[PDB]
Amino acid sequence: SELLVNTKSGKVMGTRVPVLSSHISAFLGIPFAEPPVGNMRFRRPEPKKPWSGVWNASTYPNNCQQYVDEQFPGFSGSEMWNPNREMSEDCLYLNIWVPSPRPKSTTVMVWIYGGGFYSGSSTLDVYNGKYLAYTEEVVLVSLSYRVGAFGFLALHGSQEAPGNVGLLDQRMALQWVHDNIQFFGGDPKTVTIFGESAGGASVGMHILSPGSRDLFRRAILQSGSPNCPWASVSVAEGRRRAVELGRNLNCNLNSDEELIHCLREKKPQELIDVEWNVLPFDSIFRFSFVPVIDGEFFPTSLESMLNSGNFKKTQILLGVNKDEGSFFLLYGAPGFSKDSESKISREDFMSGVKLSVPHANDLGLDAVTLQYTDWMDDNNGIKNRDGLDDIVGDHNVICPLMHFVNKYTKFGNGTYLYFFNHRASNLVWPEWMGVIHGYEIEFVFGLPLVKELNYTAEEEALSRRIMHYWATFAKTGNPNEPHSQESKWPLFTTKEQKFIDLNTEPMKVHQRLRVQMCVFWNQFLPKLLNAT
Amino acid sequence: SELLVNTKSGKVMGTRVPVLSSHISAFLGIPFAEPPVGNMRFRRPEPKKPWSGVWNASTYPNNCQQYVDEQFPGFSGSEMWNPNREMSEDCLYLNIWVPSPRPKSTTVMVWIYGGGFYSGSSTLDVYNGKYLAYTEEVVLVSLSYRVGAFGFLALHGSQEAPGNVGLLDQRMALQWVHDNIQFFGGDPKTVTIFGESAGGASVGMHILSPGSRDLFRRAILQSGSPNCPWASVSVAEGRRRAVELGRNLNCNLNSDEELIHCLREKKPQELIDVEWNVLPFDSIFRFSFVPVIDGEFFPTSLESMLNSGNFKKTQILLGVNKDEGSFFLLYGAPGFSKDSESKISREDFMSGVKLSVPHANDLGLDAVTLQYTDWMDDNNGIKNRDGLDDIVGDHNVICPLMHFVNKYTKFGNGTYLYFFNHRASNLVWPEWMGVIHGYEIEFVFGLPLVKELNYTAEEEALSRRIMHYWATFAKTGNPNEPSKWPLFTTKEQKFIDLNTEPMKVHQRLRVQMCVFWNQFLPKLLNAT
Ligand SMILES: *[C@@H]1O[C@H](CO)[C@@H](O)[C@H](O)[C@H]1NC(C)=O
Ligand SMILES: *[C@@H]1O[C@H](CO)[C@@H](O)[C@H](O)[C@H]1NC(C)=O
Numbered sequence A: 001s002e003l004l005v006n007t008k009s010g011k012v013m014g015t016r017v018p019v020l021s022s023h024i025s026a027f028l029g030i031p032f033a034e035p036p037v038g039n040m041r042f043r044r045p046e047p048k049k050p051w052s053g054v055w056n057a058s059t060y061p062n063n064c065q066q067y068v069d070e071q072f073p074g075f076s077g078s079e080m081w082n083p084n085r086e087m088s089e090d091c092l093y094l095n096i097w098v099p100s101p102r103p104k105s106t107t108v109m110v111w112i113y114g115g116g117f118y119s120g121s122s123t124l125d126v127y128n129g130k131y132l133a134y135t136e137e138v139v140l141v142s143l144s145y146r147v148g149a150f151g152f153l154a155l156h157g158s159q160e161a162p163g164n165v166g167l168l169d170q171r172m173a174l175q176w177v178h179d180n181i182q183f184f185g186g187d188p189k190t191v192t193i194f195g196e197s198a199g200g201a202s203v204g205m206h207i208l209s210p211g212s213r214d215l216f217r218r219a220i221l222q223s224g225s226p227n228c229p230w231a232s233v234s235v236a237e238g239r240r241r242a243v244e245l246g247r248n249l250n251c252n253l254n255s256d257e258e259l260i261h262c263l264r265e266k267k268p269q270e271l272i273d274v275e276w277n278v279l280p281f282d283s284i285f286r287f288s289f290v291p292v293i294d295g296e297f298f299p300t301s302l303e304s305m306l307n308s309g310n311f312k313k314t315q316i317l318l319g320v321n322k323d324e325g326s327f328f329l330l331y332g333a334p335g336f337s338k339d340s341e342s343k344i345s346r347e348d349f350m351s352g353v354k355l356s357v358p359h360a361n362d363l364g365l366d367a368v369t370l371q372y373t374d375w376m377d378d379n380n381g382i383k384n385r386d387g388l389d390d391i392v393g394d395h396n397v398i399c400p401l402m403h404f405v406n407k408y409t410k411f412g413n414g415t416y417l418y419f420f421n422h423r424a425s426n427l428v429w430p431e432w433m434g435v436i437h438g439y440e441i442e443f444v445f446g447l448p449l450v451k452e453l454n455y456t457a458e459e460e461a462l463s464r465r466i467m468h469y470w471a472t473f474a475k476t477g478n479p480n481e482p483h484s485q486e487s488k489w490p491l492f493t494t495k496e497q498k499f500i501d502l503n504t505e506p507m508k509v510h511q512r513l514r515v516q517m518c519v520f521w522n523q524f525l526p527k528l529l530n531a532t
Numbered sequence B: 001s002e003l004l005v006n007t008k009s010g011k012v013m014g015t016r017v018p019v020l021s022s023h024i025s026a027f028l029g030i031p032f033a034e035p036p037v038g039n040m041r042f043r044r045p046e047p048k049k050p051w052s053g054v055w056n057a058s059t060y061p062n063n064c065q066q067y068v069d070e071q072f073p074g075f076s077g078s079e080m081w082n083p084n085r086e087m088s089e090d091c092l093y094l095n096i097w098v099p100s101p102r103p104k105s106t107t108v109m110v111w112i113y114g115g116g117f118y119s120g121s122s123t124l125d126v127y128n129g130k131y132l133a134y135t136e137e138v139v140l141v142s143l144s145y146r147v148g149a150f151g152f153l154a155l156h157g158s159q160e161a162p163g164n165v166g167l168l169d170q171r172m173a174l175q176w177v178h179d180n181i182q183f184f185g186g187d188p189k190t191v192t193i194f195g196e197s198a199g200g201a202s203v204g205m206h207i208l209s210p211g212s213r214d215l216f217r218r219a220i221l222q223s224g225s226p227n228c229p230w231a232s233v234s235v236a237e238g239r240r241r242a243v244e245l246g247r248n249l250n251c252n253l254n255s256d257e258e259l260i261h262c263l264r265e266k267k268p269q270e271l272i273d274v275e276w277n278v279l280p281f282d283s284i285f286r287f288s289f290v291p292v293i294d295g296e297f298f299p300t301s302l303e304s305m306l307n308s309g310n311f312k313k314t315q316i317l318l319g320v321n322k323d324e325g326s327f328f329l330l331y332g333a334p335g336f337s338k339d340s341e342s343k344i345s346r347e348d349f350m351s352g353v354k355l356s357v358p359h360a361n362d363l364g365l366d367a368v369t370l371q372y373t374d375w376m377d378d379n380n381g382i383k384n385r386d387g388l389d390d391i392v393g394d395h396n397v398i399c400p401l402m403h404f405v406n407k408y409t410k411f412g413n414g415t416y417l418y419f420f421n422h423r424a425s426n427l428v429w430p431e432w433m434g435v436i437h438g439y440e441i442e443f444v445f446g447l448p449l450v451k452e453l454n455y456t457a458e459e460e461a462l463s464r465r466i467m468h469y470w471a472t473f474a475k476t477g478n479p480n481e482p483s484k485w486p487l488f489t490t491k492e493q494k495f496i497d498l499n500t501e502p503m504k505v506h507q508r509l510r511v512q513m514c515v516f517w518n519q520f521l522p523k524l525l526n527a528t
């Protein structure tokens, strides 16, 4: 049968799902590892031992234990990111969308959800893969990984909670695709991994990690890179937060054994109710438990690896959105509201920069302030809002990614940079937020194609050309169809540094995405802070 | 006789001079101090001893001993600033232009030449005071002071070479005006001291110094303020440079007394030939012997005086030119030429900022570089040239003056700020230099009023309104006579452009860059 597939770990039964007046096969909730429960919490994942019979893979699996956003109860703008299925530590499953009839050895694209490494699910509506798998004729995989303490608690030295197990969970799902995707009509030699935000950081992390390199062909990074200030911590910082989590729950802090054993006795929600209390400073765009530069998953410092070219050399397609930071200012900085224009006073602007660059000293803070303050009009609420907006987006996403793209391009075999700046017609968030963090995803996933979602005709075209760029890139390493016809997305070179805007208007080629601000964030500020 | 005046020091005989198809009286080279020669070298000035008979005040006096610019021989653009009389240590004299007939108790304006404290003359053509004295009916005086080591060699503690004697020469000339100007129809109670560059800084220094405050009513500072980075040094740096000047001339350095006896045996030119060797860094807009913060002429640090309001409270009228730094890049920065557009490679730009901010560490240099580099086009020679140009102008003149203006206005009784940006139609310097340092001077002195100088009619009108602003201000404390030049307040921070077009009011002159130069860089350097 088309829906019955025999994998290396057991039989699986999918379900025929309708998609845009047609249909396709979907294998949902396929396990790829042993439930990391009990004495398995915090430990490296273990392959799902083979099962007998037929696994019912017709419904979405559970979502990993995570923090749930309740800021705006009922609001679709925020609710669309919360788990839409029951949470559980038993959450290591992957979803697959196969074109019907089943391809022979077609391109495969593996999605890695974002969520600051503290949240995220593979079952969200904006990640429904039937549209992209169907339209571009690709085998689309949806993986999952442990988040928060459950996936990144790190006590370097210990083997019970070594850290980066969330990254290892992803790697095991990738090793699984490598071993069984051929049975679903996918070609394991042509697999592309792509993700947004924390997911984009992950992709760049597999690009770097020797243990992940051979498990994929190419990579796509959306609004995130391995070197983001919020994407990792030192073993020292990791241990401290680990111990502080224990302190927070009254645990025996004498040994990693006692601390860990204590943590494993707590219910999931207990660890989550205190998750945010371990951060070093009051801040925005900083998450408690994230990847650690251990010296194993990451041989050396991310920078030294980027400089020496120690990473997979292949093709990459990456980019960012116009307003990466508004979402985070709305939730954590004073003066911001989703119900107003959020004009910021000079006082709140100041509080906003300290909140945005929590690791900076006074001199650093003055440098940032000066770099984004129009001193002829310092009391302009609008310029203060947008300035603070750019600070958050530049420091946390755009510039770290530009540093990555420039370093990588020195060794890579092809780079394609994009600047997504389209404000969706049916956006439910206030206009001041602009092109919000995560809102290029619904276009990558073809949501604009479904009529009842009420997107405009031009947004459907944008979605269609974006999915095609992604898919064509996945298949060939180039988003452009060889001597096709339409405008050509140019390669990003260390010399020209070209990139295109992604929106509903004709293609526009640009150069040096936000160099001025990024030179500040990538070169000057670091030297300023390093000096004291 | 109108040309014969009895001063408290002795008789003076002036000379009737023609000015724009008319005449006025001119008393040139009147001694106000004892010749600071021989044993008087480096010492505070001594009042001129009364003479008997009639002093011939019909011709300009000597210019003080100074380094002479020879970069462009014959070139009028640089020549107009060189001594135009015999140089001599016997140079403490002042000149006076009195409108004819001799007015009765009228406004007095005292000019103090600039020149980095290492040069300058009161006899230059651009300082001829007949046009301004005539046109605005004011009594115009140009004084003189010792420059270079002769006026600022400072060995604090010593009474033989205490430093700041050049500022004192200035003060003695003012004291002389305060005592004798009434005899020329001047009103000692309505005296305005004005100067450009080093002279503008001097004006600001008299504004701060308790010993100078009662000798004048109001002040005008052009392209200079007391707090300029090149306008002063500490007693330690002053001594260090002094001792180094000795080292350069194989002088006995065992004691100040021996070092000083040695320096006094040398001919003026021997001191000058080594003057520049005492600077601490390779640099531009940095001069060897300048005023020193001694705790005497300057009670405490310039900044503390500005903060505590420890200075004369009155009306001030000051400004800067659009391109203050081009003159200095041309003489000391790589890539610059007088006969070229001077596009600056990226390499020359780098060494250029290094030369402009000699005291900064590497982080400071990166900060300055980042602040002035358009990274979407960093290999643009024009932008690199203009950028380096603004760095030198902003750091040395504009921002230091703006910090001064903002501090003063908190206690002052009236501030009028200007931004002069009119490129002379008949300028001999290349276009890239723009509105050059010192070139608003010819307008203040009304040179555009003389037909054979080939200025345009609009430049003559500009000169006339500038002179009237200066004179009216000098005369009432307001450049406006009852388009209004708005008063500068700490709140509005208004200022006007000074050019051939109609008046345009603006706010916060170069505030973005000056926040960097006045607040961020200093803090960066103090922390690193
Ligand atoms: C798989 O589960 C779905 C959802 O309840 C159900 O409709 C389907 O019949 C199940 N498959 C079998 C035959 O167990
Ligand atoms: C990629 O590598 C191939 C083979 O080494 C080479 O021919 C090609 O020029 C490279 N392309 C890029 C964009 O570096």
Ligand SMILES: *[C@@H]1O[C@H](CO)[C@@H](O)[C@H](O)[C@H]1NC(C)=O
Residues within 6 Å of the ligand: B056, B058, B059
């Ligand atoms: C004053 O000195 C000048 C300069 O030599 C001389 O020409 C003039 O005749 C002198 N005045 C008189 C008449 O004493």
Ligand SMILES: *[C@@H]1O[C@H](CO)[C@@H](O)[C@H](O)[C@H]1NC(C)=O
Residues within 6 Å of the ligand: B412, B413, B414, B415
């Ligand atoms: C100047 O001083 C007078 C007298 O004290 C005062 O009334 C006036 O407001 C002051 N003007 C300015 C510009 O400060």
